[PDB]
């Protein structure tokens, strides 16, 4: 996260670290949506241009964390993966259209003060909250500049109007994406950066006081550049695929 701040303890209890087994390294962020299902960005698992193609056994998920590098004894839980599901129409060739993937854990993780699932939006929550000007929240352990954080970082960022997102880039933008970030005129700054991807863009519903995951950190061009924006996978738009995977392969 660029221009963010330290997260408070238990502030983002659905935040997951995607962690490579060998060598031991942070791959991406991710999120806990039930006791056995974790959501992330497809490109954290599969990106052929850079020879990225992880299988289940390459990977661990670390849940309940605050510190990036430390083993958080008695606080974090580390889970092995049963199965990975990549959206079948994930577009890694062009624009990361449908940058989404589910990971089923081998065993359920136990909930705690530090480990707790985020809600997935219904149609009405999306309609109501996914509006230009409305702010969501992004968290992760990725780069602080285009070093690395000691602890989980956080930044609140406004959703940007579709024409401004599109006019910011040469990449073709789809209905399965939205962008967020401040304008150069707005003064404030902040963005996701390398390591943050696959993590959640969340919003707190003013109707029922619950946190909903509206987006997945997907891509940008640099980090926190003036006139550029962070692009996020539109979660509600892919929710039918999410429900189909969970219904079918979930117990």
């Amino acid at each position: 996260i660029v221009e963010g701040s330290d997260a408070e303890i238990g502030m983002s209890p659905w935040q997951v670290m995607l962690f490579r087994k060998s060598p031991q390294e942070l791959l991406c962020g991710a999120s806990l949506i039930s006791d056995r299902w974790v959501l992330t960005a497809a490109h954290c698992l599969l990106y052929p241009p850079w020879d990225k193609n992880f299988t289940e056994n390459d990977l661990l998920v670390r849940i309940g964390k605050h510190s990036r590098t430390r083993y958080e004894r008695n606080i974090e839980k580390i889970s092995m993966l049963e199965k990975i599901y990549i959206h079948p129409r994930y577009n890694w060739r062009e624009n990361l259209d449908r940058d989404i993937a589910l990971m089923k854990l081998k065993k359920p993780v136990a909930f705690s003060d530090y480990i707790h699932p985020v809600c997935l939006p219904d149609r009405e929550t999306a309609a109501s909250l996914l509006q230009a000007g409305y702010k969501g929240r992004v968290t992760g352990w990725g780069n602080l500049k285009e070093g690395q954080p000691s602890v989980l970082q956080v930044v609140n960022l406004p959703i940007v109007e579709r024409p401004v997102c599109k006019d910011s880039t040469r990449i073709r933008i789809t209905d399965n994406m939205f962008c967020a970030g401040y304008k150069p005129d707005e003064g404030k700054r902040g963005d996701a950066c390398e390591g943050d991807s696959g993590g959640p863009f969340v919003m707190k519903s003013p109707f029922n006081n619950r946190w909903y995951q509206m987006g997945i950190v997907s891509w940008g061009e640099g980090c926190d550049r003036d006139g550029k924006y962070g692009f996020y996978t539109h979660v509600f738009r892919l929710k039918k695929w999410i429900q189909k995977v969970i219904d079918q392969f979930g117990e």
């Binding site: 962690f19 390294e25 670390r62 083993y71 580390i78």
Partner: peptide
């Protein structure tokens, strides 16, 4: 960079 995680996880 990263602190050793318990071997059971690897």
């Amino acid at each position: 960079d990263f602190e050793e995680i318990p071997e059971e996880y690897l």
